[PDB]
């Protein structure tokens, strides 16, 4: 009876469903009483109006297509499926939330496409070693991770204009190495050479012909190539349901967007395909370089993974660039690395070591929460991403969808999908803001007392003044014997304040700067808390003294963000693994740890304590990580037993512990010197005498 739904729901049907999801409204057309027509689903036991004419919508998370996750992506006779479900229907009443979950799997033997962008400038003359026999170099790597491989490549030098181009004596138009007293090729912006095929033979043949050209300035602007290789889908030959790898080789630094003003080029990139039948980027001379933001967009749209295959003098550079294009990797290219002939299976290993969720076309008044179950029922709230995965694993995310108010719009479809995969979960959203009886039984100049009732089904409200269930609320101040208890307890004054109650119905409505409402005018709409001089911290709407936070903000004040990026360490783990992320700032829990991301801890035990647990579960099949089944996920370092050899002193990080068998095991770990921190174990531990 005396409940929150009995304060604002009494006005109409629309405004009943709007105030709470728990509210229920009865427009019987047969049984009026004088009780509130919007109380609750159960408080309508008496005054039943049960079979119809009870309006109580309930939200629904309805699955329309959930194909089973594929086990392998190699000709499964249909529709390789890496995400389930694929389509959900959402019915949402105002201020109600309904949650669901989504399953993501990186299948084994997924098809791989590789397109190569080669710097063909003069500086690259001493770098063409990396491109001879490339097809045999590429099939040899990827064959271990996939059948059905496809490769292709293109070339780029720079914009063929001044000041980049050699326009010096016309003998330099067709041979820009004229002055060098040798010969090379005329320059070009971006030249598509070989569409993606499965013919390694034609690849090596077409590659061996390639030779360098010449321009003036060290920046070369492959970003023109990266853009066109991404958005010219039919020309490049990208396949659906195949990971798309785009490799970028270059000698030195690169032109960025707005470098073209020196060339008299002031038209921004449109991110449209401009390669045609000549296989040349036609707009190279009319269109500026692309910006990192547009490159990121078009890269995520077309689901392309950008790999920077650059020389060491410039590896630090593109590393810092890759941090501005999330999901891109850098790899050194020099015939001493012991990794150069892989360089890609290592990149594709990285790219598949993480699954992150992205949202497209999300309706504005809708907001989404996220939990993550990354490792065997370890629910991690707030995360839409899982870290350190091997190709083949499966992860799951629990999603909640919330709507503030009710848009009163048509159906809208937004997408939820992994970064870099075609597979997607499409969510169809419909909002149930109006009751069943809307245009069925509504009065106009009748159906009430004196020719004024209108405005809804179930009760008739009257004109601009003198409203009522019997249409007159006369402006006269009829003396007592009419109150209707427009107050809580009848010892309290007329409706809470700001209102002089007339005709048994409070007449507060005293517009000052914000709106006032409620049967007792208890609601304010402008008395919500302030964090710093801004109501609801500026990130939240105010309704009846309660902050209703925006999409990515939470809290009584709406000053706590749902972000986790600022909590992310340089290593990819949030709060360096030693802390919790609350409101975008790491709360370090592990003792002795501090810093922005709990990175600083000089009282923490030496790494010999954390890696001893890996050698116990990997090499002795016991320990903590063995019991929790976390060994294969947490111990991604390779472990190789050695010949009792502990040879070099080069950072020489040696460890020594004592197992349950009272045997003294000792190992060392080469840290990430030329790689990813391998660790060697001395077989034959020291055990006691017989």
């Amino acid at each position: 009876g005396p409940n929150i739904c009995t304060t604002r729901g009494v006005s109409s049907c629309q405004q009943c469903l709007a105030v709470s999801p728990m509210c229920a409204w009865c427009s019987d057309e047969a049984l009026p009483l004088g009780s509130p027509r919007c109380d609750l689903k159960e408080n309508l036991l008496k005054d039943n109006c049960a079979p119809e004419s009870i309006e109580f919508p309930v939200s629904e998370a309805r699955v329309l297509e959930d194909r089973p996750l594929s086990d392998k992506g190699s000709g499964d006779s249909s529709q390789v499926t890496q995400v389930s479900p694929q389509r959900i229907a959402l019915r949402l009443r105002p201020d109600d939330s309904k949650n669901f979950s989504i399953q993501v799997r990186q299948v084994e033997d997924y098809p791989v496409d590789i397109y190569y962008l080669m710097d063909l400038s003069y500086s690259m003359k001493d770098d063409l070693w990396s491109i001879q026999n490339l097809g045999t170099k590429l099939a040899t790597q990827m064959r271990k991770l996939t059948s059905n491989l496809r490769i292709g490549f293109g070339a780029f030098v720079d914009k063929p204009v001044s000041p980049y181009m050699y326009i010096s004596p016309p003998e330099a138009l067709e041979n820009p190495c004229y002055d060098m007293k040798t010969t090379c090729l005329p320059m070009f912006g971006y030249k598509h050479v070989l569409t993606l095929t499965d013919q390694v033979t034609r690849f090596n043949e077409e590659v061996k012909k390639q030779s360098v050209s010449r321009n003036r300035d060290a920046p070369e602007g492959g970003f023109d190539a990266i853009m066109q290789a991404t958005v010219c889908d039919e020309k490049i030959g990208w396949r659906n349901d195949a990971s798309h790898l785009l490799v970028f080789t270059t000698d030195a630094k690169t032109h960025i967007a707005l470098d073209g003003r020196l060339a008299g080029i002031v038209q921004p990139n449109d991110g449209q395909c401009h390669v045609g039948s000549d296989n040349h980027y036609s707009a190279s001379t009319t269109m500026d370089y692309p910006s990192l933001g547009l490159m990121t967009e078009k890269l995520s749209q077309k689901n392309i993974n950008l790999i920077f295959a650059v020389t060491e003098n410039v590896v630090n550079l593109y590393q810092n660039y890759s941090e501005l294009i999330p999901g891109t990797t850098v790899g050194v290219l020099s015939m001493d690395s012991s990794n150069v002939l892989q360089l890609i299976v290592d990149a594709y290993g990285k790219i598949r070591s993480k699954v992150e969720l992205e949202v497209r076309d999300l309706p504005e008044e809708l907001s989404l929460s996220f939990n993550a179950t990354c490792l065997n029922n370890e629910v991690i709230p707030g995360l839409k991403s899982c870290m350190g995965l091997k190709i083949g694993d499966t992860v799951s995310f629990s999603i909640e969808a919330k709507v503030r108010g009710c848009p009163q719009e048509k159906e809208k479809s937004f997408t939820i999908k992994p970064v870099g995969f075609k597979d997607s979960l499409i969510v169809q959203v419909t909002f149930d803001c109006d009751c069943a009886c809307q245009a069925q039984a509504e009065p106009n100049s009748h159906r009430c007392n004196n020719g004024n009732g209108t405005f809804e089904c179930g009760v008739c409200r009257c004109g601009p003044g003198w409203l009522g269930s019997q249409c007159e609320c006369s402006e006269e101040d009829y003396r007592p014997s009419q109150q209707d208890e427009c107050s809580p307890r009848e010892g309290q004054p007329v409706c809470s304040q700001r209102g002089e109650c007339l005709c048994g119905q409070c007449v507060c409505h005293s517009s000052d700067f914000g709106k006032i409402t409620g049967k007792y005018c208890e609601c304010d709409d402008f008395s919500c808390v302030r964090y710093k001089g801004e109501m609801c911290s500026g990130h939240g709407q105010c309704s009846c003294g309660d902050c209703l936070c925006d999409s990515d903000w939470t809290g009584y004040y709406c000053n706590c963000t749902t972000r986790t990026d600022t909590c992310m360490s340089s290593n990819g783990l949030l709060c360096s693994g030693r802390g919790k992320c609350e409101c975008g700032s790491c709360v370090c829990i592990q003792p002795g740890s501090y810093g922005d991301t709990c990175e600083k801890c000089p009282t923490c035990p030496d790494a010999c304590t954390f890696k001893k647990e890996c050698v116990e579960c990997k090499k002795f099949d016991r320990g903590a990580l063995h019991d929790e089944n976390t060994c294969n996920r947490y111990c991604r370092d390779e472990i190789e037993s050695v010949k009792e050899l502990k040879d070099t002193g080069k950072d020489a990080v040696n460890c020594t512990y004592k197992n349950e068998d009272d045997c003294v095991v000792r190992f060392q770990y080469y840290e990430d010197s030329s790689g990813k921190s391998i660790l060697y174990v001395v077989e034959e531990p020291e055990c006691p005498k017989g």
Partner: protein
């Protein structure tokens, strides 16, 4: 907020000429007229053999909007030989920059290509032309005998230009020295006196210029943008330039001295590829006579609400202080891909408020990607980051985006109206728009209601008609105005009066105007200007008592003013505008006499009380202090009661408690006016007799220049009565306390050593580390966590040096990380090395101690001691043979001796820790 967007001046150039790529004002000394300069760097010319030479147009104002080219050259390509031309003017982009000092017009052609006089080439040294009335000279400081991009071959000089106070040209060329970039400055007189049409590379005396640097600085593009201002001591303008590919495409901004071209200050970008330094601007925004730096990064990527990078662009705002340093804030864009920091244009004082204003542009933003210009008003605090006006481009794309706002010029009063104006160019549509400022009017209004407490028993106005008296009163409303600039001398306003507006919503209105017999009255009013508050009067009355109830709510008199803008003709109605931060209405309340006693007058007895319940707050932290207040009115009714809590500078108001039903929720509001700051809580209107209220007010503190020793609040109740209107002021203080949660932590790395040690052999005289033993490392950390800091503390380390005259943990070296100096009572590393269980502490072993002096540790800082030792293996063989395992125990204690908070209670903070290195045999 005062630019006229209604009917601005539209200027149009030829199609495809990039008309509007550069704009400026022309304000010569020989004419009281003023003009617009609009560069068309793609326009065609009558120059023979020259396709798309480019023009600079002189645009007439005051009528006809006509633009005629200014002919600087008219000459085709000069010759080096018969068929060997020396220069190439086709596609030279003449007009990509235009600047003007009073009679001088400097225009440049940054794509001007030049054959050298050494070998046949086409080098874009670029050129400039300086016109002064009829005299026209050629300025090409990059066209010299230093060629070929090892030098100035690709200078593209004139890419950016500017003038200083003393008629000195500043020129930027980004291609010099393998695109390192270059700045060049010359006296205008030296430019015109030294001109010689038969000399192509001209030596200018008194020239300033940067030099080539190391090849690491290649491809930095110094001279992309230039602005001028003085930053060190004199009046001599110093040089500012944007270099947006510097610092590994972080971007940078160089400032050079105006007298000898030496490095002065540097600004570095925060994010790569953002183009920090695409544009710069110098102007004084805080009215402190010190010029301030503005730097635009149009491609900056910030974090959206979700946390993803988005290209919104960012403008850096750096305020110059006399110390030489800079207070730099940042200002992000509002729409994605809008390129918000593209152009920055000082406007002078668009409002004539006393603080200069600026305009920032997003040429690719808005609807249909048609360009936006935001204007930001300066105040004493710096720049106001919230725009006060937004200019939207009106022209839709033909082939390329109308880049509305790509070029802007301000700070020139073209209409002589007292307020400067603003040119904006959109070279995508070959147009340039001129916005005219408006005469801001500040208006102060009044409202006087004669006796505010109305008796219904007192009827004196027989005037209603039919000669029956009634209770009446007077509504007197005054209205004064004033405003800088040129604007009509008599202003016309439309005042409206509303009686008892608080219940116009359908309830009865219980006061009417005497003659009109209605709640509403309107009157066209006309005031001249300048502080003579002109007033008018009316008569309102209370309707008959029998006609209504509800005596307790007040009669609110509402007055608003309009100021019809049909005035201010004289050039197409440059209509004035009211001050943006001014109320368009005033209200005042009247009360019906009720329950005021025998004196016929309401006299309250107001009391205010306060209790602590939270007796001490700590210094370093931000403390949830809650005050419980009791406001009583023990006398007669109080009209418009408000609780006034005057807080000091340390305090901020959080809000009212709503989770203790015993405490009443109040409408409180934070107000900062009249040089004070306080919180205003409504206590009832009227606040009836014997009423008691309890409520909670929450706050926050900073302690504001420490050692204050107390925070003071003052509380009193104020009411609009005539007698006994206020309560006694009650001062409540809360004591500042010192709390420092200091801890000491330690770890051994390794924490164990298993004997025997691999590959060890007794050396008679050991030299290397490998000869002595393994490496044991103790690390001690002194971490200050509590809110309050400390100034000084000691730290004492006890170390087990020897046992039975035999070394255990031979300290090799020690390091310190933090505010700390240490000293060991024994020489460290005497021998100069290069590179159950029985416990051994100081109680049973010879100890070596290390004493450390700790400086100031704040709330989240710490000091750390790294001890690198070597296990003396020789000791653990002879008499410690096999079944003797040892625990090498060291300890560290600290004592906090001093705090910066004098005059406060100070409690000693001491603790200790211990660190073991356990040596064990792995046999038996």
């Amino acid at each position: 907020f005062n630019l006229d967007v209604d009917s601005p001046a539209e200027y149009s150039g030829p199609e495809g000429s990039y008309f509007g790529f550069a704009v400026d004002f022309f304000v010569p000394s020989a004419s009281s007229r003023m003009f617009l300069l609009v560069g068309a760097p793609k326009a065609n010319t009558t120059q023979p053999g020259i396709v798309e030479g480019g023009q600079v147009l002189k645009c007439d104002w005051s009528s006809t909007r006509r633009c005629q080219p200014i002919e600087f050259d008219a000459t085709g390509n000069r010759d080096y030989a018969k068929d060997d031309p020396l220069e190439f003017k086709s596609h030279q982009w003449f007009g990509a920059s235009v600047r003007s000092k009073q009679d001088k017009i400097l225009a440049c052609a940054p794509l001007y290509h030049w054959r050298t006089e050494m070998k046949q080439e086409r080098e874009p040294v670029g050129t400039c032309f300086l016109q002064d009335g009829t005299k026209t000279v050629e300025y090409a400081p990059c066209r010299s005998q230093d060629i070929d991009a090892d030098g100035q071959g690709f200078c593209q000089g004139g890419f950016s230009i500017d003038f200083t106070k003393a008629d000195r040209v500043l020129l930027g060329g980004p291609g010099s020295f393998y695109w390192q970039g270059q700045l060049i400055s010359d006296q205008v007189a030296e430019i015109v006196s030294k001109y010689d049409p038969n000399v192509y590379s001209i030596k200018y005396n008194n020239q300033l210029a940067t030099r080539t640097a190391q090849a690491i600085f290649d491809d930095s593009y110094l001279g992309y943008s230039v602005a001028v201002g003085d930053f060190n001591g004199d009046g001599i303008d110093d040089f500012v330039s944007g270099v947006p590919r510097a610092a590994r495409t972080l971007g940078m901004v160089y400032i050079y001295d105006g007298k000898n071209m030496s490095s002065l200050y540097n600004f570095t970008g925060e994010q790569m590829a953002a183009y920090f330094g695409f544009s710069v601007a110098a102007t004084d925004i805080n009215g402190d006579d010190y010029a301030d730096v503005f730097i635009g990064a149009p491609l900056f990527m910030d974090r959206g609400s979700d946390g993803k990078l988005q290209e919104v662009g960012q403008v850096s705002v750096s305020l110059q202080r006399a110390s030489g340093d800079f207070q730099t804030t940042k200002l992000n864009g509002f729409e994605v891909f809008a390129r918000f920091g593209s152009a920055i244009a000082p406007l002078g004082d668009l409002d004539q408020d006393g603080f200069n204003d600026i305009a920032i542009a997003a040429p690719y933003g808005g609807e249909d990607k048609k360009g936006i210009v935001y204007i930001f008003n300066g105040r004493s605090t710096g720049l106001n980051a919230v725009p006060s006006q937004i200019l939207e481009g009106q022209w839709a794309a033909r082939s390329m985006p109308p880049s509305f706002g790509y070029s802007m010029k301000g700070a020139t009063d073209i209409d002589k109206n007292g307020y400067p104006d603003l040119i904006v160019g959109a070279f995508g549509v070959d147009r340039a728009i001129l916005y005219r400022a408006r005469p801001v009017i500040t208006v102060n209004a009044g409202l006087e209601v004669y006796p505010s407490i109305l008796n219904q028993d007192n009827k004196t106005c027989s005037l209603p008609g039919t000669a029956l008296k009634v209770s009446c009163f007077n509504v007197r409303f005054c209205l004064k105005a004033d405003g800088k600039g040129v604007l009509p001398r008599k202003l016309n306003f439309q005042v409206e009066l509303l009686l008892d507006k608080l219940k116009q919503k359908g309830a009865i209105r219980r006061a009417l105007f005497l003659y009109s017999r209605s709640p509403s009255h309107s009157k066209n009013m006309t005031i001249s200007r300048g502080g003579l508050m002109q007033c008018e009067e009316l008569i309102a009355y209370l309707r008959d008592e029998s006609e209504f109830r509800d005596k307790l709510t007040p009669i609110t008199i509402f007055m608003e003013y309009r100021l019809d803008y049909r005035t201010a003709a004289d050039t197409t109605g440059l209509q004035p505008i009211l001050n943006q931060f001014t109320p368009a209405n005033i209200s005042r309340q009247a009360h019906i006499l009720l329950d005021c006693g025998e004196d016929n007058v309401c006299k309250p007895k107001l009391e205010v009380s306060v209790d602590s319940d939270q007796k001490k707050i700590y210094i370093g932290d931000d403390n949830p202090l809650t005050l419980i207040v009791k406001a009583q009115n023990q006398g007669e009714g109080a009209y418009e009661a408000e609780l006034i809590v005057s807080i000091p500078l340390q305090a901020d108001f959080i809000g009212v408690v709503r989770n203790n039903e015993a405490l009443a929720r109040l409408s409180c509001a934070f107000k900062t006016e009249n040089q004070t700051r306080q919180v205003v809580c409504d206590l009832g209107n009227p606040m009836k007799a014997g009423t008691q209220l309890l409520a909670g007010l929450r706050f926050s503190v900073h302690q504001q220049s420490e050692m204050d020793t107390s925070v003071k609040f003052d509380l009193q109740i104020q009411s609009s009565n005539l007698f006994d209107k206020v309560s006694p002021v009650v001062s409540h203080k809360v004591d500042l306390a010192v709390l420092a949660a200091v801890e000491i932590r330690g770890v051994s790395s390794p924490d164990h050593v298993f004997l025997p040690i691999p590959n060890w052999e007794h050396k008679e005289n050991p030299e290397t580390e490998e000869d002595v033993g393994p490496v044991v490392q103790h690390i001690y950390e002194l971490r200050n966590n509590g809110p309050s800091s400390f100034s000084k503390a000691m730290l004492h380390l006890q170390w087990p040096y020897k046992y039975n005259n035999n070394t255990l943990l031979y300290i090799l070296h020690y390091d310190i990380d933090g505010p700390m100096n240490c000293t060991s009572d024994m020489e460290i590393n005497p021998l100069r090395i290069k590179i159950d269980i029985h416990t051994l502490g100081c109680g049973v072993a010879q100890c070596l101690k290390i004493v450390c002096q700790v400086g100031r540790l704040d709330r989240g800082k710490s000091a750390i001691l790294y001890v690198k030792s070597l296990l003396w293996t020789e000791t653990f063989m002879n008499k410690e043979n096999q079944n003797h395992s040892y625990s090498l125990k060291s300890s560290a204690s600290f004592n906090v001796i001093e705090f910066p908070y004098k005059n406060l209670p100070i409690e000693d903070i001491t603790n200790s820790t211990l660190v073991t290195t356990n040596v064990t045999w792995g046999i038996q």
